[PDB]
Amino acid sequence: CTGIRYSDGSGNLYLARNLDWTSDFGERVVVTPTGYTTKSPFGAVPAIRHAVIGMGIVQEDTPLYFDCGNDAGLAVAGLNFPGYAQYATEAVDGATNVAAFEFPLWVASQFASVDEVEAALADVVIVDRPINDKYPSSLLHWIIGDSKRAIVVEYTSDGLHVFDDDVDVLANQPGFGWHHENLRNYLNASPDFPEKIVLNRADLVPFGSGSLMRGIPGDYYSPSRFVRAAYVHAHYPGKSTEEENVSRAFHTLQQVAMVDGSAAMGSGEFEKTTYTGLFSSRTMTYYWNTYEDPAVRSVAMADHAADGTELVVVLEHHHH
Amino acid sequence: CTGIRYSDGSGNLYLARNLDWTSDFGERVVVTPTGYTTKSPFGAVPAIRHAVIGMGIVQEDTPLYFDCGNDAGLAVAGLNFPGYAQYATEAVDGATNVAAFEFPLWVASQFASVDEVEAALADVVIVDRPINDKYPSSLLHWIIGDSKRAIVVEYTSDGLHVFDDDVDVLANQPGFGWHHENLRNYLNASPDFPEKIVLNRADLVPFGSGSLMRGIPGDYYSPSRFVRAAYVHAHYPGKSTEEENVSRAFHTLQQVAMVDGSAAMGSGEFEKTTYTGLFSSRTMTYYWNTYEDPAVRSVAMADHAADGTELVVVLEHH
Ligand SMILES: *CC(=O)CC[C@@H](C)[C@H]1CC[C@H]2[C@@H]3CC[C@@H]4C[C@H](OS(=O)(=O)O)CC[C@]4(C)[C@H]3CC[C@]12C
Ligand SMILES: *CC(=O)CC[C@@H](C)[C@H]1CC[C@H]2[C@@H]3CC[C@@H]4C[C@H](OS(=O)(=O)O)CC[C@]4(C)[C@H]3CC[C@]12C
Ligand SMILES: [Cl-]
Ligand SMILES: [Mg+2]
Ligand SMILES: [Mg+2]
Ligand SMILES: [Mg+2]
Ligand SMILES: [Mg+2]
Ligand SMILES: [Mg+2]
């Protein structure tokens, strides 16, 4: 999985991710309205302050989000981090104790900006408290973004780490500081076109575009996707329309997507981009496409009872 | 630009390509029917033996195809090759003199298999004879495919050469022999998952998938796209349904596509994948999407009069 955060220069947030896996999870768009009665193990989510829309599943009358955005312009995505993620084994008195499964719900239902959730994270403990035993307990890290900036949250054996994500991307393991340092191994990667190099007495001109992009890796490994996504995302020109910004998400994530046959997991099955999802605060809409159909589908929070009392598992969508 | 050829194991051909450029060409789906009166400068295309569908433009009531397939399951795509392409400046008496602009029309309108066009190519001179003065004269090479195999045609200062394209892909410069030899620089690239390496006394486990794909380049340079496409295309599992094979084309070509900002041309403008097109002989349908809209659209040849007398520039599509 790879996630990205960006804006349009006019205060609107776009946060998008690939869900890469060897099978699909049965996920749907889920709306969590402001009147929903929460089921928060340690009271971190006492009520829904901001309505939430995103992709996930419902278990135990609880929304389990893979990624989601709220009606105040804040969004979050959870990505796999096994080997590094290690949550607290118990809640701590006085802390804001957040069960891992509800961490995205906590971010999006409680806060309206990265400043606010960053301030709240000063007291957070993320607890290994599974929703139930139907899936292996999660081992995740998260990217959180608003129109201004992104942060990355990693909870490991030495506790909570919050990073300034100044490249606005996230992939999988290892930890964020490792990937950020690794960017320093690609300082000669550039989109620029050189007209002529002389090497010794050889006049060398490019075959075409991309001659100084050489070195950006094309493989599916997590550190490689981080570098490749950081390059493509940094260099994509800012856009001012909803349509060009939707197109930016899907093109950028297609550059780090996984297709059949190219990389196996230990099972021997091939990892593939099962869906690509985008939250837009400008239109309070969740957009997505899937491995089987690249056409973009969408769900607008304005079409659903976001002031209602029940989780809405959305069955109808626009533009396909 | 990158092109691919594959089949479904049941005799059906899929040939697809990205059109990468700094601007849109205004291309449309063009059907050339068997009753169309040709405008072939040296008589290479005297009549349309097989109806053709593909993406291109029409000038002087002549279909100028970027890529196309015919009603017998043969298809062809033209990709940029400047610096290397060098056509004949005049027609050669006694040869099959094919104007470069009509080369894809010649392949698709005259022949029913790669065997047939390969035999005909022994006689061919490709001539620099522009359609008109509007565009710079083309400098191209081509991939030609049927359900059995692909060949690459390059016409250079060494003349016409036909290559056995046993990796079923094509990109831009340099020549096909160069790229084919370059494949030998990526022999350790693999999709396999290794459980555990020991380096000296360090136990090394993958972070996740892709640990042995390291080395496959991710940049937009032509040789890099050739290697990356050759890897993805070689390892994509064969599929037996139309839906899965359509999906295979668009996913494979998204792996080598170009998006805004990542690689500039000399002008300083960014090269982008403007459209991705696929010809399917199973359904005699041309499928495509565009930079602005990833939804797949399609035109079926059967919805147009394949034995009519006029070029059809399609507007109504799925
Ligand atoms: C490519 C990747 O990074 C893969 C991530 C993918 C497998 C994850 C991302 C979000 C996860 C779900 C989050 C919500 C719940 C959490 C449950 O944990 S528990 O409470 O400890 O039991 C596990 C199930 C589920 C649905 C996660 C499943 C794995 C994810 C889809
Ligand atoms: C990424 C790439 O490889 C880009 C290739 C792109 C620029 C080419 C591919 C097909 C070309 C057109 C083919 C048909 C005609 C041929 C004319 O040649 S002429 O008769 O010598 O004048 C030039 C115009 C046109 C439409 C070509 C334009 C360039 C291409 C779209
Ligand atoms: Cl093995
Ligand atoms: Mg699915
Ligand atoms: Mg080129
Ligand atoms: Mg266009
Ligand atoms: Mg005549
Ligand atoms: Mg007939």
XYZ file of C-alpha atoms and ligand atoms in Angstrom:
706
model
C 0.000 0.000 0.000
C 1.018 3.596 -0.711
C -0.742 6.776 0.418
C -0.450 10.440 -0.585
C -1.675 13.839 0.680
C -1.930 17.086 -1.270
C -3.961 20.253 -1.687
C -5.100 22.587 -4.464
C -3.711 25.806 -3.038
C -7.207 26.944 -2.034
C -7.657 25.102 1.236
C -8.986 21.770 -0.059
C -7.538 18.406 1.011
C -6.956 15.330 -1.168
C -5.811 12.129 0.528
C -5.590 8.897 -1.441
C -4.211 5.377 -1.186
C -3.736 2.046 -2.945
C -4.955 -1.057 -1.052
C -2.428 -3.666 -2.204
C -3.163 -7.267 -1.226
C -3.509 -10.829 -2.456
C -7.321 -10.813 -2.107
C -10.101 -8.309 -1.471
C -11.563 -7.545 1.937
C -15.226 -6.983 1.098
C -14.856 -3.305 1.927
C -17.586 -0.749 1.224
C -17.994 2.991 1.637
C -19.195 3.565 5.236
C -20.647 6.840 6.535
C -20.451 7.441 10.303
C -23.000 10.145 11.215
C -22.928 12.588 14.083
C -25.788 10.855 15.928
C -24.198 7.389 16.013
C -23.771 5.946 19.527
C -20.108 5.030 19.783
C -18.627 1.808 21.176
C -15.183 3.012 22.237
C -13.280 0.605 24.523
C -11.512 3.251 26.633
C -13.763 6.221 25.883
C -11.444 7.872 23.356
C -14.374 8.326 20.923
C -17.259 9.413 23.195
C -19.412 10.830 20.380
C -19.031 11.657 16.683
C -18.057 15.354 16.467
C -17.483 15.332 12.706
C -19.239 13.013 10.262
C -16.893 10.546 8.562
C -16.840 8.865 5.132
C -14.346 6.264 3.947
C -13.656 2.684 2.940
C -13.888 -0.149 5.444
C -16.028 -2.790 7.075
C -18.506 -2.901 9.936
C -18.132 -5.380 12.811
C -19.879 -5.218 16.197
C -21.833 -2.121 15.014
C -18.457 -0.338 14.753
C -16.900 1.219 11.602
C -13.455 -0.276 10.936
C -11.928 2.162 8.488
C -9.059 1.471 6.124
C -8.995 5.205 5.276
C -11.493 8.005 5.775
C -12.078 11.747 5.787
C -14.395 13.970 7.769
C -16.684 16.958 7.168
C -14.018 19.349 8.515
C -11.263 18.533 5.995
C -9.135 16.038 7.951
C -8.357 12.518 6.640
C -6.338 9.432 7.597
C -5.243 6.117 6.079
C -3.927 3.011 7.827
C -1.220 0.967 6.078
C 0.451 -2.296 7.096
C 3.505 -2.072 9.386
C 4.180 -5.629 10.735
C 7.643 -6.142 12.170
C 7.618 -2.575 13.483
C 4.145 -1.891 14.862
C 3.839 -2.912 18.488
C 0.905 -1.460 20.393
C 0.624 -1.097 24.167
C -0.658 -4.225 25.884
C -3.007 -2.312 28.234
C -4.599 1.098 28.626
C -2.758 3.686 30.759
C -4.599 5.764 33.380
C -4.754 9.403 32.348
C -3.818 8.767 28.737
C -6.030 9.010 25.679
C -6.229 5.243 25.142
C -7.202 4.490 21.547
C -7.831 0.933 20.391
C -5.879 0.355 17.166
C -9.021 -0.616 15.231
C -10.666 2.720 16.089
C -7.603 4.916 15.497
C -8.822 6.281 12.111
C -12.312 6.773 13.556
C -10.765 8.685 16.461
C -8.740 10.981 14.166
C -11.612 11.769 11.830
C -14.517 11.880 14.264
C -12.815 14.097 16.868
C -10.578 16.664 15.161
C -10.737 19.333 12.469
C -7.050 19.858 11.659
C -3.635 18.283 11.915
C -2.770 20.877 14.583
C -5.584 19.520 16.748
C -4.854 15.842 16.345
C -1.105 16.492 16.779
C -1.813 18.212 20.102
C -4.053 15.325 21.172
C -1.403 12.741 20.248
C 0.839 14.088 23.014
C -1.198 11.971 25.445
C -2.168 9.022 23.235
C -1.534 5.347 23.918
C -2.567 2.988 21.095
C -3.750 -0.283 22.664
C -3.790 -3.826 21.315
C -7.511 -4.358 21.957
C -8.936 -6.316 19.012
C -12.483 -5.707 17.796
C -12.940 -9.532 17.786
C -10.891 -12.582 16.733
C -12.081 -12.852 13.116
C -8.865 -11.371 11.608
C -5.259 -11.403 12.824
C -4.698 -8.408 15.082
C -3.740 -5.347 13.070
C -0.157 -4.085 12.796
C -0.500 -0.663 11.161
C 0.895 2.818 10.870
C -1.036 5.885 9.669
C -0.760 8.978 7.506
C -2.961 11.901 8.629
C -3.515 15.008 6.506
C -5.416 18.254 6.177
C -5.118 20.943 3.475
C -1.926 22.290 5.130
C 0.283 19.265 5.898
C 0.646 15.559 6.734
C 1.934 13.695 9.784
C 2.803 10.007 10.159
C 1.993 8.062 13.341
C 4.035 4.965 14.248
C 3.578 3.120 17.542
C 6.500 0.742 18.086
C 8.287 -1.034 20.917
C 9.498 2.291 22.296
C 6.155 4.010 22.073
C 4.501 6.704 20.032
C 6.348 8.503 17.251
C 4.825 11.378 15.264
C 6.656 12.542 12.135
C 6.408 15.658 9.984
C 5.701 14.039 6.607
C 7.290 16.681 4.417
C 7.121 14.463 1.330
C 3.371 13.794 1.845
C 3.628 10.010 1.176
C 3.657 6.772 3.130
C 4.296 3.126 2.224
C 4.957 0.093 4.491
C 7.963 -0.934 6.590
C 10.503 0.028 7.820
C 9.840 3.167 9.890
C 9.389 6.648 8.583
C 12.783 7.971 9.600
C 14.431 5.137 7.659
C 12.575 6.055 4.458
C 13.167 9.761 4.914
C 16.917 9.175 5.189
C 16.723 6.867 2.176
C 15.518 9.805 0.048
C 19.077 11.090 0.317
C 20.170 8.212 -1.946
C 18.338 9.713 -4.969
C 19.608 13.285 -5.081
C 20.461 13.108 -8.805
C 16.935 12.088 -9.864
C 15.290 14.885 -11.879
C 12.627 15.385 -14.569
C 14.856 17.848 -16.417
C 15.913 17.321 -20.016
C 19.676 17.775 -20.585
C 20.598 18.874 -24.094
C 24.215 17.568 -24.205
C 26.713 15.833 -21.943
C 30.338 15.286 -22.913
C 31.897 12.228 -21.216
C 35.626 12.301 -22.029
C 35.279 13.042 -25.773
C 31.860 11.363 -26.284
C 28.915 13.665 -27.044
C 25.952 12.112 -25.224
C 22.368 13.262 -25.799
C 19.246 11.701 -24.272
C 17.240 9.147 -26.174
C 14.180 11.093 -25.011
C 12.489 12.096 -21.774
C 13.544 10.592 -18.452
C 17.336 10.546 -18.820
C 17.922 12.165 -15.418
C 15.153 10.159 -13.708
C 17.510 7.171 -13.947
C 17.852 5.567 -10.536
C 14.229 5.870 -9.427
C 13.408 2.198 -8.700
C 10.502 0.454 -10.442
C 10.046 -2.548 -8.197
C 7.223 -3.200 -5.750
C 9.320 -3.315 -2.567
C 8.108 -0.958 0.186
C 11.230 1.320 0.302
C 11.175 1.465 -3.518
C 7.525 2.539 -3.617
C 8.234 5.188 -0.998
C 11.035 6.671 -3.133
C 9.096 6.403 -6.387
C 5.935 7.871 -4.871
C 7.929 10.673 -3.224
C 9.474 11.607 -6.605
C 6.245 11.473 -8.621
C 4.197 13.236 -5.947
C 6.791 15.994 -5.392
C 6.998 16.748 -9.107
C 3.305 16.609 -10.060
C 2.192 20.201 -10.866
C -0.402 21.646 -8.521
C -3.934 21.707 -9.910
C -6.859 24.000 -9.120
C -9.911 22.033 -10.327
C -11.711 19.113 -8.723
C -11.412 17.060 -11.928
C -7.652 17.597 -12.359
C -7.070 16.826 -8.689
C -9.068 13.599 -8.889
C -7.012 12.676 -11.960
C -3.802 13.526 -10.048
C -4.622 10.982 -7.331
C -5.267 8.078 -9.656
C -2.292 8.787 -11.928
C 0.110 9.203 -9.019
C -1.055 5.998 -7.380
C -1.012 4.101 -10.700
C 2.725 4.830 -10.748
C 3.234 2.766 -7.592
C 0.450 0.201 -8.163
C 0.913 -3.610 -8.202
C -0.377 -5.737 -11.089
C -0.815 -9.480 -11.459
C 2.291 -11.660 -11.659
C 5.010 -9.127 -10.748
C 5.587 -9.749 -7.006
C 4.544 -12.707 -4.875
C 3.909 -12.929 -1.154
C 5.179 -15.832 0.946
C 2.028 -17.749 0.020
C 3.064 -17.568 -3.647
C 0.029 -15.414 -4.479
C 0.656 -12.138 -6.285
C 0.013 -8.855 -4.545
C -2.175 -6.482 -6.602
C -3.749 -3.035 -6.145
C -7.284 -4.122 -5.236
C -8.714 -0.615 -4.977
C -7.470 2.955 -5.082
C -9.429 5.401 -2.946
C -9.458 9.198 -2.688
C -11.093 11.534 -0.161
C -11.789 15.090 -1.388
C -12.752 17.729 1.187
C -13.679 20.192 -1.592
C -16.687 18.052 -2.567
C -16.880 15.852 0.578
C -16.783 12.891 -1.734
C -15.016 9.542 -1.622
C -13.799 8.407 -5.061
C -12.423 4.985 -5.973
C -11.670 2.454 -8.656
C -10.709 -1.214 -8.506
C -8.411 -3.770 -10.103
C -11.289 -5.005 -12.261
C -12.582 -1.580 -13.391
C -10.519 1.625 -13.683
C -13.631 3.832 -14.044
C -13.891 6.197 -11.074
C -16.893 5.689 -8.798
C -17.947 8.147 -6.130
C -20.085 8.629 -3.012
C -20.960 12.132 -1.763
C -21.478 12.600 1.980
C -24.306 15.018 1.025
C -26.364 12.068 -0.308
C -26.437 10.327 3.056
C -27.871 10.943 6.505
C -24.674 12.301 8.064
C -26.718 13.678 10.974
C -28.472 10.323 11.401
C -28.051 7.803 14.168
C -26.897 4.672 12.320
C -23.760 3.700 10.419
C -24.586 3.723 6.699
C -23.050 1.007 4.519
C -23.455 2.652 1.138
C -24.965 0.550 -1.621
C -25.364 3.109 -4.446
C -22.761 5.251 -6.163
C -22.182 7.759 -8.957
C -20.308 7.688 -12.293
C -20.446 3.891 -13.016
C 5.232 5.145 -26.007
C 5.184 1.435 -25.115
C 3.326 -1.358 -26.933
C 2.530 -4.964 -26.012
C 1.161 -8.068 -27.779
C -0.366 -11.163 -26.192
C -3.008 -13.814 -26.676
C -5.454 -15.820 -24.575
C -4.286 -19.266 -25.617
C -7.464 -19.666 -27.724
C -6.327 -17.900 -30.861
C -7.372 -14.357 -29.901
C -5.011 -11.389 -30.311
C -4.626 -8.411 -27.977
C -2.333 -5.551 -29.040
C -2.186 -2.393 -26.961
C -0.141 0.768 -26.541
C 0.364 4.011 -24.593
C 0.544 7.229 -26.660
C 2.967 9.323 -24.613
C 3.377 12.945 -25.683
C 3.490 16.539 -24.469
C 0.102 17.282 -26.052
C -2.979 15.589 -27.499
C -3.065 14.707 -31.160
C -6.848 14.847 -31.563
C -6.908 11.205 -32.528
C -10.199 9.367 -33.087
C -11.299 5.804 -33.732
C -11.220 5.275 -37.518
C -12.789 2.353 -39.371
C -11.432 1.685 -42.851
C -13.944 -0.580 -44.657
C -13.271 -3.054 -47.438
C -15.090 -0.848 -49.987
C -12.962 2.259 -49.415
C -11.203 3.623 -52.531
C -7.545 3.885 -51.603
C -5.131 6.766 -52.125
C -1.829 4.889 -52.149
C 1.030 6.929 -53.721
C 2.964 3.957 -55.188
C 0.207 1.387 -55.410
C 1.136 -0.548 -52.258
C -2.484 -0.476 -51.003
C -4.599 -0.954 -54.159
C -7.741 -2.081 -52.271
C -8.724 -2.902 -48.696
C -8.643 -6.712 -48.323
C -9.403 -6.701 -44.569
C -11.402 -4.063 -42.729
C -9.371 -2.056 -40.207
C -10.182 -0.347 -36.906
C -7.798 1.742 -34.818
C -6.809 5.144 -33.479
C -5.569 7.838 -35.837
C -6.425 10.904 -37.859
C -7.767 11.401 -41.370
C -6.093 13.769 -43.819
C -6.823 13.942 -47.553
C -9.462 11.185 -47.121
C -6.649 8.848 -46.016
C -6.580 7.046 -42.615
C -3.328 7.851 -40.783
C -3.217 5.182 -38.112
C -1.242 5.345 -34.869
C -2.225 1.695 -34.199
C -4.901 -0.567 -35.617
C -6.114 -4.131 -36.041
C -8.004 -5.917 -38.807
C -10.919 -8.386 -39.238
C -8.429 -11.309 -39.562
C -6.644 -10.809 -36.241
C -3.498 -8.940 -37.317
C -2.592 -5.646 -35.630
C 0.175 -3.018 -35.715
C 1.325 0.033 -33.755
C 3.742 2.773 -34.811
C 6.034 4.306 -32.156
C 8.527 7.183 -32.399
C 12.057 6.313 -33.543
C 13.848 9.579 -34.549
C 17.621 9.339 -34.694
C 17.320 5.783 -36.019
C 14.500 5.694 -38.577
C 15.745 6.646 -42.049
C 13.390 6.005 -44.928
C 14.179 5.850 -48.620
C 13.945 9.250 -50.258
C 12.451 7.880 -53.502
C 10.437 4.887 -54.616
C 12.373 1.927 -56.030
C 11.090 0.538 -59.316
C 10.061 -3.091 -58.920
C 9.772 -2.880 -55.118
C 6.682 -2.756 -52.910
C 6.990 0.967 -52.164
C 5.026 1.799 -49.000
C 4.737 5.417 -47.893
C 5.598 5.669 -44.191
C 2.225 7.260 -43.350
C 0.410 4.278 -44.859
C 2.614 1.551 -43.395
C 0.074 0.461 -40.702
C -2.759 0.663 -43.262
C -0.695 -1.545 -45.577
C -0.046 -4.158 -42.849
C -3.632 -4.315 -41.594
C -5.492 -3.925 -44.890
C -3.508 -6.493 -46.904
C -2.505 -9.397 -44.650
C -4.106 -11.961 -42.354
C -1.109 -13.196 -40.353
C 2.400 -12.299 -39.278
C 3.644 -15.073 -41.595
C 2.064 -13.251 -44.555
C 3.333 -9.777 -43.775
C 6.824 -11.091 -42.985
C 6.950 -12.736 -46.411
C 5.747 -9.511 -48.084
C 8.289 -7.401 -46.214
C 11.121 -9.033 -48.166
C 10.098 -6.774 -51.091
C 9.323 -3.545 -49.195
C 10.913 -0.139 -49.409
C 9.458 2.398 -46.937
C 9.492 5.825 -48.609
C 9.579 9.315 -47.108
C 6.518 10.589 -48.968
C 4.544 12.865 -46.645
C 0.744 12.907 -46.646
C 0.868 16.727 -46.794
C 2.920 19.555 -45.263
C 1.024 19.889 -41.958
C 3.197 17.708 -39.612
C 6.934 17.036 -39.468
C 7.637 13.875 -41.440
C 7.233 10.827 -39.235
C 10.197 8.835 -37.988
C 8.741 5.590 -36.631
C 9.255 1.896 -36.011
C 6.462 -0.662 -35.681
C 5.327 -3.707 -33.725
C 3.115 -6.147 -35.680
C 1.297 -9.028 -34.005
C -1.173 -11.815 -34.465
C -2.332 -14.415 -31.939
C 0.877 -16.429 -32.508
C 3.730 -13.929 -32.306
C 5.094 -10.395 -32.743
C 7.700 -8.920 -35.082
C 9.325 -5.486 -34.976
C 10.032 -3.578 -38.202
C 12.839 -0.963 -38.174
C 13.868 0.866 -41.349
C 17.210 2.589 -40.752
C 20.394 3.549 -42.595
C 20.938 -0.230 -42.741
C 17.617 -0.756 -44.548
C 14.611 -2.791 -43.499
C 15.120 -5.176 -40.613
C 12.535 -7.550 -39.151
C 13.055 -8.801 -35.593
C 11.511 -11.753 -33.781
C 9.972 -9.902 -30.813
C 10.096 -12.758 -28.308
C 9.336 -10.456 -25.369
C 6.218 -9.045 -27.127
C 6.984 -5.381 -26.265
C 8.318 -2.274 -27.971
C 9.303 1.208 -26.785
C 11.313 3.979 -28.508
C 15.056 4.435 -29.316
C 17.522 2.834 -29.742
C 17.078 -0.197 -32.006
C 15.475 -3.476 -31.135
C 18.715 -5.452 -30.989
C 20.090 -2.989 -28.452
C 17.099 -3.390 -26.122
C 17.024 -7.162 -26.528
C 20.676 -7.383 -25.455
C 19.937 -5.001 -22.583
C 17.507 -7.551 -21.133
C 20.597 -9.540 -20.201
C 21.408 -6.861 -17.587
C 18.372 -7.853 -15.452
C 18.777 -11.601 -15.021
C 18.320 -11.466 -11.223
C 14.919 -9.738 -11.402
C 12.184 -12.072 -10.151
C 8.673 -11.952 -8.606
C 9.601 -14.711 -6.185
C 9.420 -14.265 -2.437
C 12.592 -15.448 -0.632
C 11.954 -16.545 2.951
C 15.476 -15.918 4.368
C 18.917 -14.890 3.152
C 22.041 -15.092 5.310
C 24.693 -12.479 4.356
C 27.832 -13.265 6.397
C 26.082 -13.786 9.779
C 23.119 -11.428 9.176
C 19.672 -13.020 8.803
C 17.896 -11.029 6.090
C 14.158 -11.338 5.483
C 12.164 -9.302 2.916
C 10.195 -6.319 4.088
C 7.399 -7.672 1.886
C 6.734 -8.399 -1.778
C 9.150 -7.302 -4.502
C 12.495 -7.953 -2.823
C 13.896 -9.808 -5.871
C 12.355 -7.373 -8.371
C 15.002 -4.857 -7.201
C 16.874 -3.549 -10.230
C 13.851 -3.114 -12.491
C 14.097 0.636 -13.349
C 11.154 2.972 -12.639
C 12.129 5.906 -14.793
C 10.516 7.036 -18.021
C 13.565 6.618 -20.293
C 12.888 4.470 -23.373
C 15.328 1.607 -22.488
C 13.987 1.598 -18.959
C 10.385 1.294 -20.120
C 11.397 -1.526 -22.461
C 12.920 -3.500 -19.557
C 10.062 -2.689 -17.175
C 7.405 -3.603 -19.726
C 9.278 -6.762 -20.680
C 9.302 -7.857 -17.033
C 5.655 -7.012 -16.229
C 4.388 -8.417 -19.500
C 6.392 -11.649 -19.233
C 5.148 -12.334 -15.704
C 1.476 -11.406 -16.117
C -0.523 -14.664 -15.887
C -2.385 -15.665 -19.017
C -6.139 -15.003 -18.958
C -8.972 -16.674 -20.860
C -11.851 -14.129 -20.721
C -12.322 -10.908 -22.644
C -12.823 -8.885 -19.418
C -9.616 -10.156 -17.826
C -7.591 -9.608 -20.987
C -8.880 -6.053 -21.313
C -7.863 -5.496 -17.694
C -4.435 -7.014 -18.415
C -3.751 -4.426 -21.156
C -4.585 -1.385 -19.071
C -2.762 -2.601 -15.960
C 0.350 -3.583 -17.894
C 0.517 -0.243 -19.678
C -0.217 1.742 -16.484
C 3.038 0.216 -15.158
C 5.010 2.047 -17.866
C 2.783 5.138 -18.221
C 3.943 8.747 -17.905
C 2.224 11.220 -15.546
C 2.466 14.985 -15.252
C 5.691 16.493 -13.893
C 7.965 13.449 -13.911
C 9.886 13.785 -17.201
C 10.272 16.830 -19.449
C 11.015 17.052 -23.147
C 13.443 19.587 -24.625
C 10.612 22.110 -24.762
C 10.354 21.828 -20.987
C 6.840 20.365 -21.314
C 6.058 17.124 -19.486
C 5.466 13.925 -21.422
C 2.232 12.190 -20.347
C 0.249 9.128 -21.418
C -2.477 10.863 -23.437
C -4.375 7.675 -24.286
C -4.003 3.916 -23.909
C -5.567 1.836 -26.674
C -6.220 -1.875 -27.101
C -7.278 -3.898 -30.163
C -9.047 -7.231 -29.379
C -9.583 -9.674 -32.239
C -11.920 -11.826 -30.063
C -14.588 -9.110 -30.119
C -13.176 -7.032 -33.042
C -13.292 -4.075 -30.689
C -10.995 -1.150 -29.990
C -10.844 -0.143 -26.306
C -9.230 2.959 -24.846
C -8.946 5.355 -21.953
C -7.298 8.765 -21.624
C -5.250 10.883 -19.259
C -8.406 12.740 -18.214
C -10.627 9.671 -17.705
C -9.505 6.117 -16.833
C -12.876 4.571 -17.658
C -12.540 2.202 -20.602
C -14.491 3.173 -23.727
C -14.962 0.937 -26.746
C -15.986 0.840 -30.394
C -17.004 -2.468 -32.000
C -16.240 -2.848 -35.695
C -19.542 -4.717 -36.052
C -21.454 -1.500 -35.268
C -20.043 0.076 -38.427
C -20.319 -1.078 -42.019
C -17.029 -2.952 -42.411
C -17.867 -3.405 -46.096
C -18.972 0.180 -46.688
C -17.237 2.597 -49.016
C -16.295 5.522 -46.730
C -13.851 6.000 -43.875
C -15.782 6.133 -40.599
C -14.573 8.561 -37.952
C -16.406 7.347 -34.881
C -18.217 9.652 -32.467
C -20.719 7.266 -30.797
C -19.026 4.777 -28.483
C -19.243 2.707 -25.347
C -1.048 -2.835 1.704
C -1.246 -2.696 3.140
O -0.656 -1.865 3.813
C -2.238 -3.647 3.694
C -3.115 -3.059 4.764
C -4.425 -3.849 4.968
C -4.096 -5.332 4.964
C -5.025 -3.328 6.279
C -5.279 -1.799 6.218
C -6.476 -1.532 7.168
C -6.696 -2.877 7.867
C -8.021 -3.115 8.630
C -8.247 -2.064 9.715
C -9.557 -2.297 10.498
C -9.627 -3.721 11.033
C -8.683 -3.867 12.236
C -8.717 -5.247 12.830
O -7.676 -5.312 13.859
S -8.107 -5.879 15.292
O -9.096 -4.965 15.797
O -6.831 -5.873 15.973
O -8.690 -7.211 15.068
C -8.284 -6.260 11.800
C -9.248 -6.208 10.627
C -9.361 -4.814 9.956
C -10.556 -4.934 8.985
C -8.012 -4.528 9.231
C -7.614 -5.602 8.211
C -6.272 -5.283 7.510
C -6.372 -3.932 6.791
C -7.389 -3.970 5.637
C 5.426 8.038 -27.821
C 5.633 7.945 -29.252
O 6.246 7.029 -29.748
C 5.006 9.061 -30.013
C 4.638 8.692 -31.419
C 3.699 9.714 -32.087
C 4.410 11.081 -31.926
C 3.451 9.292 -33.527
C 2.887 7.848 -33.637
C 2.072 7.748 -34.940
C 2.339 9.108 -35.595
C 1.393 9.561 -36.730
C 1.317 8.507 -37.825
C 0.397 9.002 -38.970
C 0.841 10.364 -39.514
C 2.147 10.233 -40.320
C 2.614 11.577 -40.837
O 3.901 11.342 -41.526
S 4.156 12.052 -42.933
O 3.178 11.526 -43.852
O 5.547 11.754 -43.186
O 3.922 13.483 -42.805
C 2.836 12.595 -39.731
C 1.520 12.782 -38.983
C 0.944 11.453 -38.405
C -0.449 11.745 -37.811
C 1.884 10.914 -37.285
C 2.114 11.939 -36.163
C 3.028 11.419 -35.050
C 2.481 10.118 -34.436
C 1.172 10.351 -33.658
Cl 10.700 -20.110 -4.466
Mg -12.595 -5.541 -4.915
Mg 10.513 9.285 -26.991
Mg -7.126 13.279 -25.558
Mg -7.275 3.923 -57.513
Mg -18.052 -9.354 -47.969
